[PDB]
Design a protein around this ligand. Structure first.
Ligand code: CA
Ligand code: CA
Lengths: 237, 237
């Protein structure tokens, strides 16, 4: 409760094998403004900390009040430094108030600039794992979110960037990339998640290739302060 | 036509299957008899184009003086130049004047920062190939040099970042990464090049995994204004 305000939207992650919802990603949106960027552009270096925790609190409280019984997935801000061994207390308390299991919370790690050289973000990830949080690398395949990360540590989940997913049913190069990356993920005991799935065509290929977790407009758009139901087109068969 | 001067150094790339030297990478050094990084800092937004051409010509003229008979590999600056596909005049004229065949010249595209309108770096890579140049993606697995690039265009060679290579004989995760990337490169008909090979142990493993082209201290250090000969330990190894 400080400077400016905002809320959350939620977007389903679907298990295409069980046809069940795995969970929802919490996405920042304005009080009525529907743009994530608009809000996050209003935050700066002097207030990144106190904003990051309000995201978590808001997302958890909103999750709980909406009746979320699966996983809650939250983006971890690229401003990766500070001491992890104290900023997590606010998060633990929040989960504890709303009786939301820490093991049902996943943090998504992303990078848009090359900082700290793996070993630091590694320390953040390994820490969260030791408290029982799930962990993910986000946007794998774009930005500084690539193979260098996987090399020194492994998250439970890797979310493959939509750029690698797009039109993959008829893109031989994207098919080879995904086929080999899925082998790599398996060797590393990492679960794949395909994001930005926009069409049945992509879905069916990714499902055949062995991907279970998917996210995207084909399933459901982010719902403002709500948990969207998933497209009956795939849930009926 | 602008300010400060500089020179070049050269480091050989070895082909371990044919036991032949593949060629040399040109590395920027100041007149200051071995000054790297210092030169590259002096470049700014106003002369990133004028400094770009200068490196290429110097590299070709020097290589020519030294009697280089194999490949000459040149780092394309992070496309801060935004080369209109017509200002390649300087390089073409330099190769012609110094009788250095254009097909023996390879350009290395490193940090393709941001989704460079995807096609920007793509157009430029495609344009250089159409002229007969060789092309390489540099530092694969470190910077913005990653899978997103490989998805939309393919170079002749991909230089794998030395971070993925370091102590790979010892590192089972790094091993799976390379085993699955080498299969990928092969699917895409791309020749891999292992950078930063420092020890025999690394060389033996990389060689046994199918890597032919390699570069690093193990073979030879960068030679100031010279073409370093290669440690023949890899002779039969
Ligand atoms: Ca995310
Ligand atoms: Ca290089």
């Amino acid at each position: 409760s400080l400077d400016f305000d905002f809320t959350m939207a939620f977007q389903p992650i679907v298990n295409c094998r069980t046809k069940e919802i795995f969970g929802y990603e919490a996405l920042v949106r304005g009080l009525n403004n529907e743009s994530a960027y608009s809000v996050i552009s209003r935050v700066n270096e002097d207030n990144r900390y106190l904003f990051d925790q309000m995201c978590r609190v808001k997302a958890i409280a909103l999750a709980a009040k909406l009746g979320l019984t699966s996983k809650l997935s939250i983006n971890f801000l690229p401003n990766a430094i500070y001491v992890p061994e104290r900023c997590i207390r606010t998060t633990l308390e929040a989960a504890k108030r709303y009786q939301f299991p820490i093991e049902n919370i996943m943090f998504e790690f992303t990078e848009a600039e090359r900082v700290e050289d793996v070993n630091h973000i590694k320390r953040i990830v390994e820490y969260y794992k030791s408290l029982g949080f799930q962990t993910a690398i986000d946007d794998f395949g774009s930005g500084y979110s690539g193979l260098n990360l996987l090399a020194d540590f492994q998250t439970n989940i890797v979310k493959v960037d939509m750029g690698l997913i797009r039109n993959i049913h008829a893109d031989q190069v994207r098919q080879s990339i995904m086929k080999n990356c899925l082998k790599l993920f398996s060797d590393l005991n990492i679960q794949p998640l395909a994001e930005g799935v926009e069409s049945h065509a992509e879905f069916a290929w990714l499902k055949a290739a062995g991907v279970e977790l998917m996210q995207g407009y084909y399933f459901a758009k982010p719902g403002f302060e709500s948990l969207p139901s998933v497209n009956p087109e795939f849930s009926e068969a």
